[PDB]
Amino acid sequence: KVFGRCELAAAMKRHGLDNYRGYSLGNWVCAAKFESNFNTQATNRNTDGSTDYGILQINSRWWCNDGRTPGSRNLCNIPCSALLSSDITASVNCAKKIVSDGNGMNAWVAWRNRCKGTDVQAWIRGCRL
Template sequence: MRAFIVVVLAALALATPALARTMDRCSLAKEMAKLGVPRDQLARWTCIAEHESSYRTGVVGPPNSDGSNDYGIFQINDRYWCQPPNGKKSSNGCGLSCKALLSDDITKSVRCAQKVLQQQGWPAWSTWKFCNGHLPSIDPCFK
């Protein structure tokens, strides 16, 4: 009986997808800094990630009013920035699959988010209203 339970548990472990990574303000800021994101932007990026995904890498948002979805820690839209898995039409401005934005390695999410920022500015994120203006310093994360 024990052997059966061990086999069943092992099979379930292999069949169950890994849970997405949940970061926090400082771990995100440090990782983004290592990826070359300017330090003066880190407080804004962490605020956006907090309000968009609660710092979770594996989040796919519910459908938007136009039927699109948002992906990953920065909730990047599949209508414009990534190719959705269901073959929906997309501009795919970042040239990647939306699944790539769900990775625990945030490199592709950061690069795509930077592209969105470059082309549309901070107001591209609906949560920008929470992140516009004075934010707590990110400096304590680097001490």
């Protein structure tokens, strides 16, 4: 499923992402935008061979098991395909584990290079959340 800006923000708010670990809702919507383009089915294969899955592009070498990434820790203990679902609960739940990791949202390259230090609040303005 391809979400709308406000549609995804309300879904993330309800799943408890607004200010989870100090990151306001706009950060999460901005990240999703540049990581998957709001598309739950997005997959991207990396040079190291791991693949990124879903709305929040969660990585197979550490967080999920896709049955093809050797040395995968599968920290969120879940098959990567579960993350391409129209229901974002699994993505959001694993993302919470990733963000509490000590590196924060810097773990997402797109957040770091395109959202960090911007008016992220512009991402949820005009939304009935």
